[PDB]
Amino acid sequence: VMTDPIADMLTRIRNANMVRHEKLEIPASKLKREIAEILKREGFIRDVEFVEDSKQGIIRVFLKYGQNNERVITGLKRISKPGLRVYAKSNEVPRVLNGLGIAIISTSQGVLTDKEARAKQAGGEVLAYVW
Amino acid sequence: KVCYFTSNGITHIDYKDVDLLKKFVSERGKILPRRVTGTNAKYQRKLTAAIKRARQMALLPYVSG
Amino acid sequence: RKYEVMYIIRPNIDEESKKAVIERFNNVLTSNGAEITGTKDWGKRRLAYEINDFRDGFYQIVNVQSDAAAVQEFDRLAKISDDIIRHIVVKE
Amino acid sequence: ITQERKNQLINEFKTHESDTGSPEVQIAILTDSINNLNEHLRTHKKDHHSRRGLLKMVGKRRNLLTYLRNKDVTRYRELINKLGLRR
RNA sequence: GAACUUGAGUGCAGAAGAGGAGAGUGGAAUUCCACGUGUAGCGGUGAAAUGCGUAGAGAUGUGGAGGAACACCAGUGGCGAAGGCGACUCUCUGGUCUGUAACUGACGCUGAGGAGCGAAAGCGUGGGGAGCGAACAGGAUUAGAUACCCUGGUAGUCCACGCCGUAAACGAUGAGUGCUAAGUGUUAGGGGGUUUCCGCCCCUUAGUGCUGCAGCUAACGCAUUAAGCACUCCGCCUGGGGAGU
């Protein structure tokens, strides 16, 4: 059965990205929606729509490709998993691809990027890497 | 070829209907294969049961001679 | 439930004996809480092959509605009798 | 399990007029199937394939009983009395 | 703690199936027994012989006995968790699939240890025994032939109960879930499109095959039935022998 919705959402993006799809639709949740919003703010995806319905909602994500159809998102990794959680100290918050990518940490301040969390001297669960 | 039963709207094949059944057995009494008679898969199975019931009740022969 | 009992009476009997047989076995079915919906009689047909050295027989076709118990009792008696040479119970 | 027996069970155990999904209802249906199937296996001891069906039923019943007990202990206790279960 | 319905399950309406257990019934064929007709070989091999036959064989006709297996249908067809399941009828009985949104509202996944099942051979008790046939005997072959080949043939194969618990038990591929081009057969459904229909065409589920992108692989190949991309749980591997000792 479904065990890691966050991982599953990342995989939908990875798979859709791999075949240069324009858009994908992810079943929504509060945490998945926050991750999607970071990707837009950080310029990894084009746009994100939240469609309501009777069920839990759908996130339509529009992927972003440069000139020459180049994929902006090169890779996505799930770090914290249901089987092995990963929490980081404020000073041990990882940089991703030597600062060319981002890491998404869930903190008590909110769901931030690595840079944002570092400025607040906050740690927390390291959700994913994106580069 | 087309299935005789779907064409004529035959829902229930019956082992009693010997005259109909006899169109599906060979000269020797062998049940003709579906590939040769064009019957639908579903109706071939129903038809096979009918012939076996008929052969049991002496309406059709097992071996013609 | 609806069953269709067909059976074959040996062809070497007179009409008096035949009617006796039919009444006897129809009574068995009804006796065990059945109800005879239909009763066709195909009459003497040529058997496809010899049964007990008989090339012909009288084909009866009794439709009934009954439980297991009723149809099973026909089977037992139909086998024992020497007049009925073959039978088949069939759910409809 | 005949249809009229099933209607008896569901009406007797349902938590409300339209209720057919409640743990109570499901456990009642299963309990009869389990008892009914046990009787069949007493004569046809060697019907291993059918028996496997019983084992899934037994597991389903235990899971529904476990769910009920954890959701609301009261409701759980009432049901096992009416059904005569040892759980 | 309170809600929600997608997961899971229940209800309701349909569908297919060698799924299982029990009890019956049927036709072909082999063997044996009796009888009629009938005479000198039959059988077997690469070639022969052993063997059977004038005591009447083999061939042929009628009837009967008994045991085992179910031609045609039959199909990378169906069903089952796997082993496996194929004549017909009835009794009992498990599971799966499709639609529905009437109901419960996360009740789910995996699962060490444990329990149950598990081809064939084999074992115990008692039946049964046609065909087949380890062992064994004889005839050949051969340098030898404790084999291949031939003629016989015991256990066994079959049944009831119990035991055994192993297979190249294989897709050499653990279970669950989701995501990621297409084309093309085929099985069981649903909906629709011109219709009495037939049918053709379109769509949709769930299986079962082939081809084939992306991706993966040492290569061969896999490829919506993944060996791709992911997450959960379990099992297992760490050079070859020694040794599955």
Cβ B57 vs Cβ C86: under 8 Å: yes
Chain B residues within an 8 Å CB radius of C47: 58
Enumerate neighbours of A (3 or more CB pairs within 8 A): none
Q: What angle do CA D33, D34, D38 make, to 5 degrees?
A: 115
Name the token pair of A109.
């301040």
Maximum CA extent, chain A: 43
Method: cryo-EM
Q: In chain C, which among 58-77 make CB contacts under 8 A with chain B?
A: 61
Closest CA to A127 of A1, A3, A4, A2: A4
| Alpha-carbon Rg for chain D in angstroms | 14
Q: Is B46 on the interface with C (CB under 8 A)?
A: no
CB proximity B64 to C under 8 Å: no
- As given in the structure block, the two tokens for residue A108 are 């008590």
Q: How far is the alpha carbon of B12 from chain C, nearest alpha carbon, in Å?
A: 10
Q: In terms of DSSP H, where are the helices of chain D?
A: 3-13, 23-43, 48-71, 73-83
* CA separation for the pair B57, B48 (Å, rounded): 14
Selected for mutation to probe chain B from C2, C42, C47, C49 (highest B CB count within 10 Å) is C49
Q: Resolution in angstroms, to 1 decimal, for this deposition?
A: 2.9
> SS3 sequence, chain C?
CEEEEEEEECCCCCHHHHHHHHHHHHHHHHHCCCEEEEEEEEEEEEEEEEECCEEEEEEEEEEEECCHHHHHHHHHHHHHCCCEEEEECCEC
